Amino acid sequence: GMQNLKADPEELFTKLEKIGKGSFGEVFKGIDNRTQKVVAIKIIDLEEAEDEIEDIQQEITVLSQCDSPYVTKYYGSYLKDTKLWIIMEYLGGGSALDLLEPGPLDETQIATILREILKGLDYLHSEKKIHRDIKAANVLLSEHGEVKLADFGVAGQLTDTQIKRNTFVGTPFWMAPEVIKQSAYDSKADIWSLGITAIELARGEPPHSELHPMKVLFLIPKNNPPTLEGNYSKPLKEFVEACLNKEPSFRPTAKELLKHKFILRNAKKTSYLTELIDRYKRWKAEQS
Ligand SMILES: CN1CCN(CCOc2cc(OC3CCOCC3)c3c(Nc4c(Cl)ccc5c4OCO5)ncnc3c2)CC1
């Protein structure tokens, strides 16, 4: 099971104020009392959240096996009475979805964000892991513009005896057709979700965003794949099209997409993304 579970978290960390909800539990800011670095603490009431427990175990397992600058760093899991503390690196720049709220991105920002997402997917997929919930809300940034994949709550693991998954998980607007159909699928599902995320970064919202999620559960397998419509560069449109193939084996790998024209021509230093982070802080501060 979970061999490296720890105890007595408050000997090592200080729990500070609530900073969000992780659907499983609450998320708190915290301090590593050893380094004085800020951490993010997700507290899960084990007494309450009873059948997502197998998902909790899954999230912990996957995280404890990841070591990448492009994946939210995992400190450890701590048992404390009826509570499980999952302690991770704090990322202060908000999510990519947050950064969209004040207005449109330009294609340099879109490419920069996508390139780092792609480095994350390359890492995960090389580790036979599948994120299965790629969307802007699960892409978090440090206050200086580093970009990491977050929320491994439904991440899947492939093995020598299980080469495909088939579980119905993810977020409907971003889900690949084969996942909705619960066919046998793999990392190529993440590549479809990446394509929807590209549209989301460009347009602000995924295709079908105004419809009830249950509707899209039939629309996505039925309809032709979405395309990126509007006045965007040809390489961006082709990048999206490449990802959004109904046939999974025809989608490129993350490795391959890192050499796409759109990425090569437009991605720049992640530090430039602090402009976006500042735009959000400004916007959020004057929001009524
Ligand atoms: C103007 N600003 C307001 C302050 N803000 C800081 C952003 O704060 C976070 C919030 C987190 O919680 C998430 C809840 C789900 O949506 C995304 C935000 C962070 C986070 N969450 C987290 C997730 Cl998603 C999954 C497992 C976890 C987690 O914490 C420990 O275990 N992780 C890291 N940093 C967070 C910072 C800036 C803008």
From Swiss-Prot:
Biological source species: Homo sapiens
Position of the signal peptide: none
Protein's recorded name: Serine/threonine-protein kinase 24 36 kDa subunit
Residues where ATP binds: I19, G20, K21, G22, S23, F24, G25, E26, V27, K42, E89, Y90, L91
Active-site feature positions: D133
Domain of life (superkingdom): Eukaryota
Domain Protein kinase: start-end pairs: 13-263
Residue span of motif Bipartite nuclear localization signal: 255-269
Modified residues (Phosphothreonine): T167
Residues at which Mg(2+) binds: N138, D151
